[PDB]
């Protein structure tokens, strides 16, 4: 068991995903969570921006990071791992519009950073980005869409997904509630979000204690909202 | 101690203190172990000029730099000598000695016997003596000579620094 | 504790250099003298096989008319500075347009072996003494494998090599003539090489300032060797 | 112990031991000092000997005509940055023929100290450095050492024997600031005889003297260039 | 423990070893203490002055080499030097490239960039010091931002790094960073060093401010309150 | 403990990381060149006969490099398609300098060559690939030789590598044929040793492969035998045994 | 220290794990050669052809240029190895050069090549001693031994290999002050030290002379059976 | 131990860390492809592991050429990148050598793309293996490329979870006569025969390469077999 | 790591000189420490070159002392060509060949059977380079 884990090129007897497992546990050494939703054509991220400190500028300490106009992104994990594969992500769609010039789908954004990963996957020279991305944009006639892509190399589209400490459970209240057939309005996805962060969190929805970000076909730049934003959409649950 | 103070009072020594007086060793995290266990048993029990019976005690050990400073500071050692490769007064002494210890032609000339000796020991002009007695066997002759004694010096000289 | 030279000892010490120190002994013994008539080198010659060639242990060599070499340790990692200290008088031939000192050349010689421990290779088993007539006089240098060098009225390297030098201190003055100090140096080899000597084991050169000539003092060295 | 490598790597304590062994070989004998004035800035290295046939070995260099450095160990990497600080100053002549200031070249020394100290393959400095010069804002007194730091100093003193040295420094540094050139010297010769071993009194042959100033040059000074600065030393009561 | 001897090696759970003992090696380092104010920023820093071979003052620990960026370090501090240069570098380049400052979330951003790609790679390490950006831009006031040399970097009206890490925010809390001028949080930050082990183990001791704002131009100024002591006697005040 | 890395003097000056590649040989697949004059022949058995094997290779153990030149490989696979690969280019870069078809030991040298050199550097590895070559050439016509994963080589009338290669050069001992070595008492050897040295019982001939050279046409000619002729050849060996019955 | 590397001395100045080579060489073919009157002879036993093996591509000696040859003691690949550099290298340096190529030269070239392949890491240095004998230094033939430690020297009669252990005493046992006259007496001192080989009958002794102005002349099987014969005689008449 | 290297040799002359990548290989995915006088049928089953997964957005069956299919067992990411680097060496090939490449070819230079991470300890290999099929004059092909670099030509093969199961499974059916139509019956079969739990069209995806071409199958056309399969 | 302390227990066994005498012996003597085989202590170093003609004589005729020899096999042929064997390589042939001659029921050594006796023996050592 030792040994065959102590750099990130050695497989195991097993092939298994030790030094990924290894990376996805320093994810959740970053104790926050998130979680994200898809809709009819609206989609909603979210994060557990669970105030560390009054001395900290609350609008710097976001995880929320808009890459690009249209592309939503919410991250979990490792801080400075964090900030270097989102800005890697900016330069990826500053070299798609340099190159191609067109749209970069949050499908081919998310593919590409997934394959990244695993090209650090590959070689013993780089340690992958010890964190976990969320990537939301709009499509052709699709609405929106949610992408997740992680160390592992891993790349998939997701009708909702969550990450960090209550990822588990909160991808079974999902797994729960969107698991039907239903009227996912933009209401209804705040809904949804919101229902999601307060089945793991268990305090009260304070208008200051996450962040929540939007993305809809109606108005495709992304959004992150503020606090009294937030209130104004917290309201909608307390009803 | 118990024993050698039922005696008339006993003087006691010790070899390779090194070994003995080296201080502990955690990183091993266990191997041949029992050194951790007995070793302070002298070093701590123990007694220097102030707390000692009426026993006299001497360490000796080829290694200084790994001994403990409870043996290296008092309660343990009252003083600290040093040595080196005999010189050469020291080389012509040591045949001097070496002299009585065989029947020889003693008409040799250890002078030169001990510069011919670079850097060496004494233990090894010992073992050149009783080579020299070698000489004498191999060529079955009653006595030893200068001969004998220059050639069994060579015998460490040539072939032991060839 | 010393896989490499990447890092020193608990007391600050490198477990490499020491090392060096004593493969200073692993050759035959080596004497160099400086007097102000000159400067003098010796090596013990003593052979492997007398049917190799006598002269191919070139452990006394001339690196140019005014300015000779002699080695301890390997005679392959001592080829490579050798062949450095002979290539620099070409190079200031080459570049300069006039000759060379030994001060310099020994420099050089200490920067190349100076490589191993702050390149971007090895370091090398060999002490040098080089003794030259240079534009500053006669001048012996010393250096060991750590690549720094001192001057030197004398030196001894090789096996036997702090004997020789503790008993030459009885013997030695900055300043008299080579052939007295050739003299003296001489009644030392002759206990220090192996027991008698001969051009088996024994092997001299000399370079002075009336004299930019024609280093290699051998077979006409003959009678101090018979002197002795 | 398994923390004691790479410059890399950090022992659990959150330190790199490797460089507290670099800065202990530094600590391995006989004295040098350092110290400057209002007028003038001097180093002092005494040039140890081999034998009754081999030359005392120089530890001072000349680096440019306003600053000098010297030496403690077999100078591997020493002369090596002393002849990098010699270019430095070439190329500070190159583009504004400007002896340029001394703080602001040690600074310089000081990141290239620290650059080995991150990366693999390159082991730490085994050397610390001393430095007298003078610019057009002052003289100064400058050390470096293994742990890539630079400290501007009225006195300073490295390696064994040497506390007594330092001692004396810490008590007449009341005095080191406005000497003039031999008073100066003199302060520093007086800390070095501090440090005699019990056996001995200083002699030209070893005693060895770096100096610059307001208006000289950095100049080296041996034997009986020394001996007109060793005039007015301590003298031996008790 | 054990995971550990590889900053590019993951533990198999928590976060990177090779980056705290980095972390602990900022433990051991004197304090270091910043707080904004309406135009800008003020730094102050505490440092031993070894004994009196040292020359009365000197290798301060505060810098000002850029327009408008102020700077203070804490941990390892040639390292800090070294790293300084990098926030000096980008500076000019961005106002070179692109014509006009850059913001400082930028430039806490690509700075602390080269500190956490070097653990990445194992055959380097990051920094053993963290820094602390404050500065002043016209289109979005003054700002001041906290950067670990594990990565960790986030914006903040006040802050403190070094052997008081976690005490000294008591007496950030109790300042109006928003409202109070540069001017008296000078003084407020000489007596709150002061406060927090002035010299009460590193008894040779000696304190540095800074004063960066629009009134000096957003330049960086390391304040000399040498002269006429009013931030001293001000910290002196605390003491009784 | 002196195979823990490539290139490491042991104190019997023996580098057993270079024997570990000699002994990666102990279960490839075998293959022989028989004794053969006037002509030369490469011969091996499959290891991966199966029910649904495609077979689309048409030569999974003979390979053709040239034209005139074919080799047989025993070892890992992969260094195999890339060494067999680098004769052909070795072959072709020879041939656009010198406008000449390359001898065959020049070309045996020139590849274990690189082979040395993979075993000389670390941070390298030996290819575990044994072969053996024929081929026509203007220096001595009709060739055959043997070439192992650490660069050593040598010429050979027959030879034989991979299981079983004890009872394979027994044989050839015993059925040597010195000056005598037509093609066609090669292919009669070969009948019997394909069974023999093959671990089977009553051989089935699609497990083997079979491939000769000879100058039948002046510009030289390359043949490989199909399952039936293979076959036909297996069955003269069963009469041949079914006639030595008269004396078991 | 210890012998786990080349690059490391020991904590006695010894470079056990370079020393390994003498037993390297020790373990190959036997080999002898001598500088005669003015031809160099030398000869090679331990074929031991197995049967369907040969010794024509076995190649103990090569012949580099028409006045410089070797005798490869050790393992063949890094003796073909050396065939391939120094051939190539004395025929270029010759075709090219203002200054013709001699034994000495390329003895120089290969001890620095061997000295250099010590001075790095992770490149095996070749593990091969060998005889190399020229026609031309300045005119005169000349014999040296080389050591895969790099250092090499000149020699008046040497044996390598297996043939390297005995010989060192049999050549001083009975070497004349007479340099072996003519080509009669070097054959006969080359048959007298080959003897040192299994059988010493010409069965698997071969050998090669050099004539000191012609290129390498080969003792073929239709005439190696005189020089037998002659050594034969030569140690039944002295009987 | 030796695994902890890939450039070091075993005593037993073999390469450890080369089979821990085949049993990667052997946890991963099951896949299925078998060849009919029509043409060539691959198929994979596929997971909603969460019921969250975008179900027709992410695939597993990739066309490398229109007339080449290929489908994996092994890890997606390494899959993915591999099958990058497949396109652009195919299409270059197509391009510099005037010649849609022939299936035997594209499989032995991405074998060699394998092999290139087989040497040096700076590099690890990919864990998958791939299934490979394709049309060329008339004639279809079917081929196995693993993780050492190795390669096989199959008339019917399986791998992945279950994989001993799959062979013997298409030993008890296969023919070389086969209707492509009968051969998906028996490729989705297999599939069914290979994964626990009820399966729909959905959970199953399927590539064809006919003489007219590759292409992969729509849930509407895999929904054809998914009913009325036994 | 005691077979160091050993070592100083074994030089302190010979010299602390006594009637009792000790033998050291092994085929691997050319890699010992001079501290271990220091000449002028240890006495005298005895060689066994490989086994001559005469030796290997009296060594098979000694080793084949036993078994029922035949005329046939003269053991010339086995003993006189070459530095060819170890005495217990002789042995070992002498019990080989007359297993040889059992399995065979030849209860009379005979020619052939130390043939193949030697055929088989003398590759069981391993190679070189």
Not at chain 1, 134 to 160: H, N, S, T
Not at chain 6, 162 to 173: E, R, Y
Not at chain 7, 191 to 207: D, F, R, W, Y
Not at chain 8, 50 to 79: A, F, N, W
């Amino acid at each position: 068991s030792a040994g065959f884990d102590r750099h990130i090129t050695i497989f195991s007897p097993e092939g298994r995903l030790y030094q990924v497992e290894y990376a996805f546990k320093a994810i959740n050494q970053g104790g926050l969570t998130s979680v994200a939703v898809r809709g009819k054509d609206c989609a909603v991220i979210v994060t557990q921006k669970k105030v560390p400190d009054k001395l900290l500028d609350s609008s710097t300490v976001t995880h929320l990071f808009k890459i690009t106009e249209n592309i939503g992104c919410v991250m979990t994990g490792m801080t400075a791992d964090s900030r270097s594969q989102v800005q890697r992500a900016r330069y990826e769609a500053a070299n798609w519009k340099y190159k191609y010039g067109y749209e970069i789908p949050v499908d081919m954004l998310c593919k590409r950073i997934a394959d990244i990963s695993q090209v650090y996957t590959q070689n013993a020279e780089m340690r992958p980005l010890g964190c976990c991305m969320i990537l939301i944009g709009i499509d052709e006639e699709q609405g929106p869409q949610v992408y997740k892509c992680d160390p592992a190399g891993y790349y998939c589209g997701f009708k909702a997904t969550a990450a960090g400490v209550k990822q588990t459970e909160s991808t079974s209240f999902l797994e729960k509630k969107v698991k039907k057939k239903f009227d996912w309005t933009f209401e209804q996805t705040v809904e949804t979000a919101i229902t999601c962060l307060s089945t793991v969190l268990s305090i009260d929805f304070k208008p200051s204690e996450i962040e929540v970000g939007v993305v809809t076909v109606e108005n495709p730049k992304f959004r992150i909202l503020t606090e009294a934003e937030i209130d104004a959409h917290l309201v909608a649950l307390a009803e | 101690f118990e024993m050698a103070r039922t005696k008339k009072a006993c003087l006691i020594f010790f070899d390779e203190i090194d070994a003995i007086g080296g201080a502990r060793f955690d990183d091993g995290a266990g191997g041949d172990n029992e050194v951790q266990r007995t070793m302070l048993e002298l070093i701590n029990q123990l007694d220097g000029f102030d707390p000692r019976g009426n026993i006299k005690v001497l360490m000796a050990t080829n290694r200084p730099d790994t001994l403990d400073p409870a043996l290296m500071r008092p309660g343990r050692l009252d003083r600290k000598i040093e040595f080196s490769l005999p010189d050469l007064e020291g080389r012509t002494h040591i045949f001097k000695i070496h002299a009585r210890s065989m029947s020889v032609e003693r008409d040799i000339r250890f002078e030169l016997l001990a510069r011919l000796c670079p850097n060496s020991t004494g233990a090894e002009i010992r073992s050149v003596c009783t080579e020299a007695g070698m000489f004498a066997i191999r060529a079955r002759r009653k006595i030893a000579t200068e001969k004998d004694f220059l050639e069994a010096v060579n015998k460490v000289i040539k072939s032991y620094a060839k | 504790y010393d896989r490499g030279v990447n890092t020193f000892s608990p007391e600050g010490r490198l477990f490499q250099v020491e090392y060096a120190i004593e493969a200073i002994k692993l050759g035959s013994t080596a004497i160099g003298i400086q007097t102000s008539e000159g400067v003098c080198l010796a090596v013990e010659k003593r052979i492997t096989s007398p049917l190799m060639e006598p002269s191919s242990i070139e452990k006394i060599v001339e690196i140019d008319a005014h300015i000779g070499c002699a080695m301890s340790g390997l005679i392959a990692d001592a080829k490579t500075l050798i062949d450095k200290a002979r290539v620099e008088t070409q190079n200031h031939w080459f570049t300069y347009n006039e000759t060379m000192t030994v001060e310099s050349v020994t420099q050089a010689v200490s920067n190349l072996a100076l490589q191993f421990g702050e390149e971007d290779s090895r370091p090398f088993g060999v002490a040098l003494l080089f003794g030259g007539v240079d534009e500053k006089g006669p001048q012996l240098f010393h250096m060991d494998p750590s690549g720094t060098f001192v001057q030197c009225d004398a030196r001894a390297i090789g096996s036997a090599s702090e004997g020789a030098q503790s008993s030459l201190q009885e013997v030695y003055h900055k300043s008299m003539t080579l052939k007295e100090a050739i003299k003296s140096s001489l009644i030392i080899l002759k206990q220090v090489m192996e027991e008698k000597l001969n051009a088996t084991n024994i092997e001299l050169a000399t370079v002075q300032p009336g004299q930019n000539f024609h280093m290699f003092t051998k077979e006409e060295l003959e009678e101090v060797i018979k002197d002795i | 112990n398994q923390y004691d490598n790479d410059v890399t790597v950090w022992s659990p304590q959150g330190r790199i031991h490797q460089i507290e062994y670099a800065m202990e070989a530094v600590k391995q004998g006989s004295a040098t000092v350092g110290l400057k004035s209002k007028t003038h800035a001097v180093l002092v290295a005494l040039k140890r000997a081999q034998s009754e046939l081999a030359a005392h070995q120089k530890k001072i260099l000349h680096v440019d005509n306003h600053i000098g450095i010297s030496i403690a160990g077999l100078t591997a990497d020493a002369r090596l940055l002393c002849n990098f600080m010699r270019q430095e100053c070439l190329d500070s002549r190159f583009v504004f023929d400007r002896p340029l200031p001394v703080s602001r070249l040690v600074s310089l020394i000081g990141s290239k100290t620290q650059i080995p100290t991150q990366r693999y393959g390159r082991r730490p400095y085994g050397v610390g450095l001393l430095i007298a010069g003078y610019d057009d804002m002052g003289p100064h007194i400058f050390q470096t050492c293994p742990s890539a730091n630079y400290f501007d100093c009225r006195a300073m003193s490295i390696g064994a024997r040497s506390q007594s040295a330092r001692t004396y420094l810490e008590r007449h540094m009341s005095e080191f600031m406005e000497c003039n050139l031999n008073e100066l010297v003199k302060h520093g010769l007086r800390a070095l005889r501090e440090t005699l071993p019990a056996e001995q009194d200083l002699t030209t042959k070893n005693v060895s003297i770096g100096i610059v100033g307001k208006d000289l040059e950095f100049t080296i000074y041996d034997d009986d260039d020394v001996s007109p600065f060793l005039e007015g030393l301590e003298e031996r009561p008790q | 423990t054990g995971y550990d001897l590889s900053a590019s090696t993951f533990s198999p759970d928590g976060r990177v070893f090779q980056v705290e003992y980095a972390m602990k090696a900022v433990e051991n380092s004197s304090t270091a203490i910043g707080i904004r104010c309406k135009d800008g920023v003020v730094f102050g820093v505490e440092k031993l002055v070894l004994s009196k071979l040292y020359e009365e003052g000197s290798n301060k620990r505060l810098f000002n080499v850029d327009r408008h960026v102020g700077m203070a370090v804490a941990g390892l501090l040639a390292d800090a030097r070294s790293l300084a240069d990098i926030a000096r570098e980008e500076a000019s380049n961005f106002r070179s490239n692109f014509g006009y400052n850059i913001p400082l979330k930028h430039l806490a951003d690509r700075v602390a960039m080269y500190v956490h790609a070097y653990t990445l790679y194992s055959a380097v390490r990051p920094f053993g010091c963290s820094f602390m950006l404050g500065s002043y831009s016209v289109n979005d006031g003054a700002q001041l931002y906290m950067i670990d040399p594990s990565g960790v970097s986030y914006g903040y009206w006040g802050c403190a790094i070094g052997k008081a890490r976690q005490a000294a925010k008591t007496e950030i809390e109790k300042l109006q960073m928003k409202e109070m001028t540069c001017r008296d949080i000078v003084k407020e930050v000489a007596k709150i060093i002061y406060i927090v082990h002035d010299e009460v183990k590193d008894k040779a001791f000696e304190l540095e401010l800074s004063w960066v704002g629009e009134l000096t131009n957003g330049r960086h100024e390391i304040v000399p309150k040498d002269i006429r002591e009013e931030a001293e006697k001000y910290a002196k005040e605390s003491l009784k | 403990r002196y195979d823990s890395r490539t290139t490491i003097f042991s104190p019997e000056g023996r580098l057993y990381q270079v024997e570990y590649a000699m002994e990666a040989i102990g279960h490839a697949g075998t293959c022989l060149g028989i004794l053969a004059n006037d002509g030369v022949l490469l011969a091996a058995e499959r290891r991966n006969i199966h029910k649904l094997l495609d077979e689309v290779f048409f030569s999974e153990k003979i390979y053709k490099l040239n034209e005139d030149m074919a080799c047989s490989v025993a070892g890992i696979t992969s260094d195999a398609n890339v060494l067999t690969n680098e004769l052909r280019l070795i072959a072709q870069r020879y041939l656009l300098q010198y406008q000449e078809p390359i001898p065959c030991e020049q070309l045996v040298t020139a590849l274990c060559d690189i082979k040395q050199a993979y075993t000389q550097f670390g941070g390298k590895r030996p290819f575990g690939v044994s072969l053996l070559y024929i081929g026509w050439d203007k220096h001595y016509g009709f060739q055959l030789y043997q070439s192992d994963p650490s660069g050593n080589y040598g010429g050979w009338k027959a030879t034989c590598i991979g299981n079983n290669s004890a009872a394979a050069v027994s044989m050839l001992k015993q059925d040597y044929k010195e000056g005598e070595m037509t093609l066609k008492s090669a292919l009669a050897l070969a009948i019997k040793v394909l069974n023999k040295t093959m671990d089977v019982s009553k051989l089935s001939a699609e497990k083997v492969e079979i491939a000769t050279l000879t100058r039948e046409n002046g510009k030289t000619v390359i043949r490989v035998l199909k399952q039936k002729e293979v076959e036909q050849l297996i069955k003269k060996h069963e009469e041949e045994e079914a006639k030595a019955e008269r004396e078991k | 220290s210890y012998d786990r590397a080349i690059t490391v001395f020991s904590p006695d100045g010894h470079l056990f794990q370079v020393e390994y080579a003498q037993e390297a060489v020790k373990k190959g073919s036997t080999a002898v050669g001598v500088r005669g009157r003015d031809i160099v002879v030398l000869g090679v036993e331990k074929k031991s052809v197995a049967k369907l093996q040969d010794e024509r591509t076995v190649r103990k000696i090569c012949a580099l240029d028409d006045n410089v040859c070797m005798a490869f003691a050790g393992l063949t690949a890094d003796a073909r190895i050396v065939i391939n550099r120094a051939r190539v290298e004395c025929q270029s340096h010759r075709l090219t050069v203002e200054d013709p190529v001699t034994v000495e030269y390329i003895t120089r070239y290969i001890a620095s090549l061997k000295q250099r392949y010590t001075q790095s890491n992770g490149r095996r240095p070749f593990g091969i001693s060998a005889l190399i004998v020229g026609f031309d230094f300045d005119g005169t033939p000349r014999l040296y031994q080389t050591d895969p430690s790099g250092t090499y020297h000149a020699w008046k009669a040497n044996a390598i290999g297996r043939g390297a252990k005995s010989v060192r005493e049999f050549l001083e046992k009975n070497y004349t002050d007479e340099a072996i006259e003519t080509d009669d007496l070097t054959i006969k001192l080359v048959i007298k030290a080959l003897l040192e080989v299994v059988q010493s009958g010409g069965k698997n002794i071969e050998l090669a002379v050099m004539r000191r102005d012609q290129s390498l002349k080969i003792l073929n099987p239709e005439e190696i059976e005189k020089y037998v014969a002659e050594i034969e005689k030569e140690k039944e008449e002295n009987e | 131990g030796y695994s902890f290297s890939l450039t070091t040799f075993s005593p037993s002359g073999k390469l450890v860390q080369i089979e821990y990548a085949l049993a990667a290989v052997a946890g991963g995915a099951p896949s299925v492809g078998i060849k009919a006088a029509n043409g060539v049928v691959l198929a994979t089953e596929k997971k909603q592991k969460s019921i969250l997964y975008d179900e027709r957005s992410v695939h597993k069956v990739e066309p490398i050429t229109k007339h080449i299919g290929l489908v994996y067992s092994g890890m997606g990411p390494d899959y993915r990148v591999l099958v990058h680097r497949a396109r652009k060496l195919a299409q270059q090939y197509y391009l510099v050598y005037q010649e849609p490449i022939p299936t035997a070819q594209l499989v032995q230079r991405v074998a060699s793309v394998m092999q290139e991470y087989t040497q040096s300890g700076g590099v690890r290999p990919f864990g998958v293996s791939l299934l490979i099929c394709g049309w060329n004059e008339g004639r279809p092909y079917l081929f196995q490329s693993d993780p050492s670099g190795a390669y096989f030509a199959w008339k019917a093969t399986a791998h992945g979870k279950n994989y001993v199961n799959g062979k013997t499974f298409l030993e008890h059916h296969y023919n070389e006569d086969l209707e492509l139509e009968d051969a998906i019956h028996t490729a989705i079969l297999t599939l069914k025969e290979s994964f626990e739990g009820q399966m729909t069209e959905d959970n199953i995806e399927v590539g064809i390469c006919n003489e007219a071409g590759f292409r992969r199958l729509t849930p509407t056309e895999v929904k054809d077999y998914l009913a009325a399969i036994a | 790591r005691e077979i160091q302390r050993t070592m100083l227990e074994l030089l302190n066994q010979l010299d602390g000189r006594g009637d009792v005498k000790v033998i050291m012996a092994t085929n691997r003597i050319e890699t010992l420490d001079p501290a271990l085989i220091r000449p002028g202590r240890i006495d005298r170093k005895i060689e066994f070159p490989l086994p001559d003609e005469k030796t290997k004589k009296r060594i098979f005729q000694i080793h084949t002392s036993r078994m029922t020899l035949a005329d046939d096999v003269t053991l010339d042929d086995l003993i006189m060509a070459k530095d060819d064997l170890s005495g217990a390589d002789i042995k070992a042939i002498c019990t080989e060949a007359g297993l040889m001659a059992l399995r065979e029921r030849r209860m009379k050594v005979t020619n052939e059977d130390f043939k193949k006796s030697k055929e088989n023996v003398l590759y069981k050592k391993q190679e070189g380079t």
